[PDB]
Amino acid sequence: ELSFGARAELPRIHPVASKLLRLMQKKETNLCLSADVSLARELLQLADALGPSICMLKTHVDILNDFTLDVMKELITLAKCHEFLIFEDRKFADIGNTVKKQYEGGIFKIASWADLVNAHVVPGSGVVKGLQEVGLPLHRGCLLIAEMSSTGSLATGDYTRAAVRMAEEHSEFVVGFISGSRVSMKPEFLHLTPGVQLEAGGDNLGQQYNSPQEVIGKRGSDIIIVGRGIISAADRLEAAEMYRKAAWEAYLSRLG
Amino acid sequence: ELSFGARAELPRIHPVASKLLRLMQKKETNLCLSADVSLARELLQLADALGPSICMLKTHVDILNDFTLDVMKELITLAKCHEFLIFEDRKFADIGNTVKKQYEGGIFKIASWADLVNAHVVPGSGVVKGLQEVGLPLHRGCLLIAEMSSTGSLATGDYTRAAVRMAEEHSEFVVGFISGSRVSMKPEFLHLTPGVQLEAGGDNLGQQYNSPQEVIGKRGSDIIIVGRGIISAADRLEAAEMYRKAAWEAYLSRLG
Numbered sequence A, B: 001e002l003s004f005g006a007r008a009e010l011p012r013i014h015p016v017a018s019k020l021l022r023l024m025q026k027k028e029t030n031l032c033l034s035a036d037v038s039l040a041r042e043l044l045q046l047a048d049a050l051g052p053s054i055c056m057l058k059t060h061v062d063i064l065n066d067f068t069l070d071v072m073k074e075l076i077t078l079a080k081c082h083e084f085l086i087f088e089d090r091k092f093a094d095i096g097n098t099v100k101k102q103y104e105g106g107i108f109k110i111a112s113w114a115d116l117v118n119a120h121v122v123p124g125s126g127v128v129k130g131l132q133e134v135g136l137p138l139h140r141g142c143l144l145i146a147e148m149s150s151t152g153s154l155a156t157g158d159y160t161r162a163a164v165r166m167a168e169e170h171s172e173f174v175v176g177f178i179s180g181s182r183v184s185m186k187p188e189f190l191h192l193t194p195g196v197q198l199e200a201g202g203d204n205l206g207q208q209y210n211s212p213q214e215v216i217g218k219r220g221s222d223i224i225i226v227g228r229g230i231i232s233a234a235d236r237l238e239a240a241e242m243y244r245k246a247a248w249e250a251y252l253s254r255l256g
């Protein structure tokens, strides 16, 4: 297994993946904050304070009550300052002709500020082809949702294999996966895993949690995505540090 | 087979489905306009002119460059005047805790103006449970995506069956399907079919077209969803009338 820093140099690495892997190695973090808040001020205060602890900040722009493109300008300033990527977890999942407009346009102009987006594979490869028309010229990357953390997920077996094939056939734009585990044997692909908490359990709407040690160390993923385990804690900085140290040590132990 | 007007009276009918079926019968239309435009003025001018010809107007609010909640107030005025439902084709597809916020909140406040939304079933039933927390109190309905019109769709076989079971187990909120065909034998459920044009073909991003006669008459669906076949035509009113007459006659011929 190569280190994150060595994977950043792989011949077929995507530039967005390379940038991410280099800052993960530099900062000793494989934590993605899931900034699931409704106030711009809270989003930005979290991004500033937790920026040094994270490799990535994941947004849901469509829950932000006071969204403006100026909020996103300020978030980019923090991402550049503290060195993390912005991942809009939009889960594009329509026909190619529709998703290109949803990615470039409307109020959110997602492609203008998001380093990474993601897509469901269920609609077939046209979803990727439509997003790539906007994202390739803008030097962006995309993650495919190969496995989901929720109870009753149908993203198993042949579905997961289809996601891996779609990614591997669109490597110009697709840089990895949302998954619960390593799903590709190709080290150029990232694996990002949500459904992570230090304690066992779930929520009352189908979320299921596994620990950083389980998903990084045993299941072979690269990055943990953590929302409520950090955002519901009183001291979100120390919570982020706990998650960072857990994910980083699990990675080091698996690298050996 | 019961008429639309008789299905509107079925004991287990959802109120939103009943309202829709009654106005379909009254107006002799089973056409849903896919209003895939980026200008509010064009959206509203289409809704006004085509309102008498349609049972439903399908939106993608996230491609509207000049979205405001006031645009949606004006769209509701037209929907009430001309008697059609508003369907936001948001394709919710996240964990339950996330989709409830995406449905109620953010800039779009979708639940405040959309009679209908839809969801992908891949994340498991938590997607429906989260949307129902917001939609049931607001008297809304939801469609589940059981089949997709795009090339490479993975919404086949066991996936389609899982969508039908999920709908049938959440009938308080789920009123039907996006599908290419009749997928449920229960007449309380609606079937809405996109990927429709009078002429054969597709697009260059995986869209595939079938005719109104095929999807209503042979495949047993209830409603056709038509975008470019109407919106790219010069005279969008006469195009809508052609599609309305095609879908309505195919329905009458199958009812016999």
Ligand SMILES: O=c1cc(O)n([C@@H]2O[C@H](COP(=O)(O)O)[C@@H](O)[C@H]2O)c(=O)[nH]1
Binding pocket: A034, A036, A060, A089, A147, A148, A149, A150, A178, A194, A195, A196, A207, A225, A226, A227, A228, A229, B094, B095, B098
């Ligand atoms: O499989 C997936 C994919 C996701 O994007 N997510 C997202 O990751 C976050 C999980 O948040 P939390 O840690 O609070 O449960 C949410 O923003 C959710 O939308 C997920 O939980 N499971």
Ligand SMILES: O=c1cc(O)n([C@@H]2O[C@H](COP(=O)(O)O)[C@@H](O)[C@H]2O)c(=O)[nH]1
Binding pocket: A094, A095, A098, B034, B036, B060, B089, B147, B148, B149, B150, B178, B194, B195, B196, B207, B225, B226, B227, B228, B229
């Ligand atoms: O299976 C599906 C589901 C959809 O919502 N759609 C939507 O229906 C519309 C199809 O538009 P058109 O008729 O221009 O191809 C688009 O808005 C698309 O997002 C689809 O085409 N196929």
Ligand code: PRO
Binding pocket: A198, A199, A200, A211
């Ligand atoms: O599931 C378990 O037992 C352990 C306890 C903490 C998280 N994983």
Ligand code: PRO
Binding pocket: A197, A199, A200, A201, A202, A203, A209
């Ligand atoms: O299962 C639960 O309810 C709590 C909160 C998530 C971790 N343990």
Ligand code: PRO
Binding pocket: B198, B199, B200, B211
């Ligand atoms: O596919 C076909 O042959 C016919 C021609 C018009 C639409 N259906």
Ligand code: PRO
Binding pocket: B197, B199, B200, B201, B202, B203, B209
């Ligand atoms: O296939 C095509 O390109 C045209 C446009 C849709 C119907 N026929």
